[PDB]
């Protein structure tokens, strides 16, 4: 099962009477719910996303400079102008230059000098943003029976059910097929102002980079780059990527400040890299709180025959699950369907079953079936799947 493989796997084992269970589901983790007389379900937060979020401002990583003009006046001849100063598509610098007879001035002294350049952006050199809205986010919670039954014929996950919630629609009932019904009441807890969360992307170039990053809107708005709203004619703060040279008598050179990709990516080291799946923009981190209702969950294959004790084989012998439980898979040569006779005993006590089953009524189906998961006390145990045995030593405490 997908859940058995995760580092962040939590267990919730209800009592004979428990019908409501409160859970925090984090992105990238899972929870295995076990309830007596009920099957085990794997519940997990699959995604927190918004489709088509509002675009923020866009930034310029590399300025395209052009049509540089320099105007100069002589000492006491007033100031030098260029119309480009009261224009938005430009960057300008007023300075003074040393003037004299050998550069057409009747006076030796400082004279006015102005240089202007036309600032735009290079093709594919923008950093774009999208901001979230709590009113528009969607969060997907998945439920699947913990049986380890996969349809490796059409590569389909059997019994997997998806519940989609919004801030308004935050209640659901999922029908787990022949296992009955599970109710979920999930409240999203962002902890972070979604309206203050930005997803940042960079226009694709030849180099291979992460998809996007999840940044705080505070920070994103403080980037020292020219910016604009998609549709705007010119870039605001275009002067951030320009450097003016020392003025000569009537000439003053205008230089570029380089490609800021490296600068930005240095800042983004240690920032969580986020995913985009078409129109779906994903929050890299978050969690949700559910009240899981198990009352309508029924045990599958109760009236099935018990599997013949001698028809078992080890498909996968007892191994540590990585969560202080033992996992295994059996192959049953006999006639299907049927209930597996599984138990475990601690050395010295043949008559006492010590197996606290995570898969409560293991059955061999005419399709899948055969996976058993159990919690065993520390020490030397023997695991029995009918007459089929295997010794297991259980490590003390937890290595977590």
């Amino acid at each position: 099962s997908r859940c058995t493989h995760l580092e962040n796997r939590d267990f919730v084992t209800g009592t004979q009477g428990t019908t409501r269970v409160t859970l925090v589901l984090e992105l990238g983790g899972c929870v295995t719910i076990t309830a007596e007389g009920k099957p085990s379900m794997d519940v997990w937060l699959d995604a927190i996303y918004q489709e088509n979020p509002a675009k923020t401002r866009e930034y310029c990583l590399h300025a395209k400079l052009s049509d540089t003009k320099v105007a100069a006046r002589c000492p006491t001849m007033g100031p030098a102008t260029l119309a480009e100063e009261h224009q938005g598509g430009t960057v300008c610098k007023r300075d003074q230059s040393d003037r004299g007879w050998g550069n057409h001035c009747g006076l030796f002294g400082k004279g006015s000098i102005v240089a202007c350049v036309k600032a735009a952006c290079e093709a594919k050199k923008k950093a774009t943003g999208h901001v979230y809205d709590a009113n528009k986010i969607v969060y997907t919670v998945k439920v699947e029976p913990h049986t380890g039954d996969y349809v490796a014929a059409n590569e389909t996950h059997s019994g997997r059910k998806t519940a989609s919630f919004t801030i308004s629609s935050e209640k659901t009932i999922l029908t787990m097929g022949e296992y009955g019904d599970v109710s979920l009441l999930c409240r999203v807890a962002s902890g972070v102002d979604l309206a203050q969360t930005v997803i940042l992307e960079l226009d694709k170039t030849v180099e291979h980079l992460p998809t996007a990053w999840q940044v705080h809107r505070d920070w994103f708005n403080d980037l020292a780059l020219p910016w604009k709203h998609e549709g705007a004619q010119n870039w605001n703060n275009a002067e951030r990527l320009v450097e003016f040279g020392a003025p000569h008598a009537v000439k003053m050179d205008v230089y570029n400040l380089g490609d800021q990709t490296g600068v930005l990516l240095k800042a983004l080291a240690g920032v969580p890299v986020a995913h985009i799946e078409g129109t779906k923009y994903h929050l890299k981190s978050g969690h949700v709180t559910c009240e899981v209702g198990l009352e309508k969950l029924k045990m599958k294959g109760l009236t099935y025959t018990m599997c013949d004790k001698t028809k078992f084989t080890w498909k996968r012998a007892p191994t540590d699950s990585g969560h202080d439980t033992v996992v295994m898979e059996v192959t049953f040569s006999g006639t299907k369907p049927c209930r597996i006779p599984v138990r475990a005993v601690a050395h010295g006590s043949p008559d006492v079953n010590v197996a606290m089953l995570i898969t409560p009524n293991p059955t061999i189906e005419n399709n899948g079936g055969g996976f058993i998961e159990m919690q065993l006390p520390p020490g030397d145990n023997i695991i029995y799947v009918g007459e089929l045995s295997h010794q297991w030593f259980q490590k003390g405490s937890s290595i977590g």
């Binding site: 395209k64 400079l65 052009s66 049509d67 540089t68 003009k69 320099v70 105007a71 100069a72 230059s97 040393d98 004299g100 007879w101 050998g102 550069n103 057409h104 000569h248 008598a249 009537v250 000439k251 003053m252 050179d253 205008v254």
Partner: protein, 80 residues
């Protein structure tokens, strides 16, 4: 080098790398272009005055200067 008399009285010399360290005659005057970073014509350009130096004066801190012709401007691209 091409010379054009832009209707607003003004005159503009558009030079290239080949035009470096050469004399160009504009109207009754002549201009000398000494600009070292010149290239082919493009968007990456620089435009500034080509100073009229009074007869028998040493030009100083200028890489484009004229004699006997006023209001001359220099433009060049930095491509190639």
């Amino acid at each position: 080098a091409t010379v054009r008399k832009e209707r607003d009285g003004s005159t503009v010399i558009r030079a290239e790398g080949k035009d470096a360290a050469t004399q160009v005659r504009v109207e009754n005057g002549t201009c000398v272009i000494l600009a070292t970073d010149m290239g082919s014509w493009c968007d990456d350009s620089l435009s500034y005055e080509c100073v009229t130096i009074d007869q028998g004066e040493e030009p100083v801190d200028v890489d484009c200067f004229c004699r006997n012709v006023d209001g001359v401007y220099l433009e060049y691209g930095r491509c190639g």
